[PDB]
Design a protein around this ligand. Sequence first.
Ligand SMILES: *[C@@H]1O[C@H](CO)[C@@H](O[C@@H]2O[C@H](CO)[C@@H](O)[C@H](O)[C@H]2NC(C)=O)[C@H](O)[C@H]1NC(C)=O
Ligand SMILES: *[C@@H]1O[C@@H](C)[C@@H](O)[C@@H](O[C@@H]2O[C@H](CO)[C@@H](O)[C@H](O)[C@H]2O)[C@@H]1O
Ligand SMILES: *[C@@H]1O[C@@H](C)[C@@H](O)[C@@H](O[C@@H]2O[C@H](CO)[C@@H](O)[C@H](O)[C@H]2O)[C@@H]1O
Ligand SMILES: *[C@H]1O[C@H](CO)[C@@H](O)[C@H](O)[C@@H]1O
Ligand SMILES: *[C@H]1O[C@H](CO)[C@@H](O)[C@H](O)[C@@H]1O
Ligand SMILES: *[C@H]1O[C@H](CO)[C@@H](O)[C@H](O)[C@@H]1O
Ligand SMILES: *[C@H]1O[C@H](CO)[C@@H](O)[C@H](O)[C@@H]1O
Ligand SMILES: *[C@H]1O[C@H](CO)[C@@H](O)[C@H](O)[C@@H]1O
Ligand SMILES: *[C@H]1O[C@H](CO)[C@@H](O)[C@H](O)[C@@H]1O
Ligand SMILES: *[C@H]1O[C@H](CO)[C@@H](O)[C@H](O)[C@@H]1O
Ligand SMILES: *[C@H]1O[C@H](CO)[C@@H](O)[C@H](O)[C@@H]1O
Ligand SMILES: *[C@H]1O[C@H](CO)[C@@H](O)[C@H](O)[C@@H]1O
Ligand SMILES: *[C@H]1O[C@H](CO)[C@@H](O)[C@H](O)[C@@H]1O
Ligand SMILES: *[C@@H]1O[C@@H](C)[C@@H](O)[C@@H](O)[C@@H]1O
Lengths: 208, 160
Amino acid sequence: SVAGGWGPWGPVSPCPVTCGLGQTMEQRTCNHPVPQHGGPFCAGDATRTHICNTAVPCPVDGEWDSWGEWSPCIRRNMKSISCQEIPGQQSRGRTCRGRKFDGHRCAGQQQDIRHCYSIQHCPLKGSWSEWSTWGLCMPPCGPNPTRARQRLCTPLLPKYPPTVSMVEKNVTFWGRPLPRCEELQGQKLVVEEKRPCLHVPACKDPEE
Amino acid sequence: SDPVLCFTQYEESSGKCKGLLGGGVSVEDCCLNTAFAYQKRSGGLCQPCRSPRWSLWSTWAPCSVTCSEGSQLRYRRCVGWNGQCSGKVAPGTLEWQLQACEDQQCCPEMGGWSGWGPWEPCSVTCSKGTRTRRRACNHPAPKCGGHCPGQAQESEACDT
Ligand SMILES: *[C@@H]1O[C@H](CO)[C@@H](O[C@@H]2O[C@H](CO)[C@@H](O)[C@H](O)[C@H]2NC(C)=O)[C@H](O)[C@H]1NC(C)=O
Ligand SMILES: *[C@@H]1O[C@@H](C)[C@@H](O)[C@@H](O[C@@H]2O[C@H](CO)[C@@H](O)[C@H](O)[C@H]2O)[C@@H]1O
Ligand SMILES: *[C@@H]1O[C@@H](C)[C@@H](O)[C@@H](O[C@@H]2O[C@H](CO)[C@@H](O)[C@H](O)[C@H]2O)[C@@H]1O
Ligand SMILES: *[C@H]1O[C@H](CO)[C@@H](O)[C@H](O)[C@@H]1O
Ligand SMILES: *[C@H]1O[C@H](CO)[C@@H](O)[C@H](O)[C@@H]1O
Ligand SMILES: *[C@H]1O[C@H](CO)[C@@H](O)[C@H](O)[C@@H]1O
Ligand SMILES: *[C@H]1O[C@H](CO)[C@@H](O)[C@H](O)[C@@H]1O
Ligand SMILES: *[C@H]1O[C@H](CO)[C@@H](O)[C@H](O)[C@@H]1O
Ligand SMILES: *[C@H]1O[C@H](CO)[C@@H](O)[C@H](O)[C@@H]1O
Ligand SMILES: *[C@H]1O[C@H](CO)[C@@H](O)[C@H](O)[C@@H]1O
Ligand SMILES: *[C@H]1O[C@H](CO)[C@@H](O)[C@H](O)[C@@H]1O
Ligand SMILES: *[C@H]1O[C@H](CO)[C@@H](O)[C@H](O)[C@@H]1O
Ligand SMILES: *[C@H]1O[C@H](CO)[C@@H](O)[C@H](O)[C@@H]1O
Ligand SMILES: *[C@@H]1O[C@@H](C)[C@@H](O)[C@@H](O)[C@@H]1O
């Protein structure tokens, strides 16, 4: 007489997460209409798995950005220590990024500090390096990819102590010295070979 | 409202999507949890819902020529959803590296023929056989593997 029909999908439980999406079940009933006097029951499943959306954002913990560059090597009550066996100090910083909806602040040091020697602009004796390996082809996707290798007047660094104290901490050389070489192929600092990269392929997104 | 596949986690090591919740959700809804990850299409690039960081450099593509000096590409990807990677670069943007490459120092050079030799015999135990002739690249002998154009053998009949 009356063939059963399914009512609408409805939830069976509260969504089990307090933020973002979760996994629940929805159910429906054969009562739209109810079967009567020998009419068929509803075909298919009364139950299914469903994603439930709370539409509520979860907390997001902050995350350190990358360390910045080292500040210049300096000593507290000295105009300059460069080209001298006088330990200085330098620092670099990072920012806690992306902390949101009551997420945790980033733990540990916002500032990084170390002992240095300044050889900034310091003239040193040099010797010529052997050829570097060929660099990358630049620009890699642009018009005329060329690769390079160099010989550099590399500086001979002073035989200073690796460590220091306040009655042992590591001391690092910092700064671009001015190394002194015999002229090689008309150059005082850098000799370069360039050459074109051959049969260059067009670079096309590998996600079409 | 462009349905994505929503995953419960990102494998840092591999950059793979793991624990599919399922589809029919926006990235916006998927990423309400920044611990989650998505795919815009089934099987492709997994994006985490956290802040954008550089992916791993890919494998070097094979050399553009098989015999000579060529070059080969590889990439890394801006992967994440709320922000930028390094500079003002938003996600799904590729960085590229182009490297010189060589499969062999030499390329195969082509050969030239010499001149057909004297013929062989057929079969004498009984009748109707075949007779052939030969040659070689004794001329411009092929340089690097190479090949001569045409045939080195040649056949015929003999009724005996
Ligand atoms: C000073 O720098 C040195 C490296 O030049 C650090 O030495 C390393 O220390 C760690 C301990 O955490 C060891 O795993 C390594 O084997 C050490 N390197 C070696 C022996 O080459 C050291 O941590 C730094 N700090 C101090 C205070 O000395
Ligand atoms: C319920 O209330 C929310 C406002 C948050 O405080 C929830 O914490 C979050 O829990 C989900 C799973 O429910 C995790 O993915 C998150 O890592 C966590 O921050 C809280 O359970
Ligand atoms: C790839 O395999 C190599 C061993 C060679 O057989 C290549 O063939 C040569 O390709 C170069 C330029 O790429 C050309 O001189 C000729 O197309 C061919 O001899 C092969 O492509
Ligand atoms: C319920 O199930 C499907 C519709 O989703 C059909 O088999 C029929 O409408 C039944 O009532
Ligand atoms: C439940 O499922 C979909 C809607 O989610 C439809 O098939 C229909 O509304 C059904 O009742
Ligand atoms: C800063 O410290 C080092 C780089 O010197 C790394 O551990 C990391 O990049 C951090 O941002
Ligand atoms: C400071 O340390 C050196 C420079 O001497 C580099 O590793 C880098 O520039 C860092 O900021
Ligand atoms: C520069 O480097 C040294 C001398 O300073 C030599 O080894 C080299 O040949 C070039 O003259
Ligand atoms: C570079 O030139 C050749 C090697 O390619 C050598 O003479 C030497 O290694 C130099 O550095
Ligand atoms: C550049 O040329 C090749 C590598 O492509 C080698 O001879 C060497 O590594 C050099 O740096
Ligand atoms: C590519 O860049 C360097 C190696 O060239 C590494 O940081 C890492 O392998 C990355 O995938
Ligand atoms: C030998 O074969 C033919 C001529 O018979 C040509 O392809 C070419 O001369 C080759 O050396
Ligand atoms: C063999 O075939 C004929 C002669 O036998 C010529 O076309 C040519 O000399 C080839 O070597
Ligand atoms: C030589 O003799 C005859 C009788 C058969 O054996 C043949 O196959 C063969 O060529």
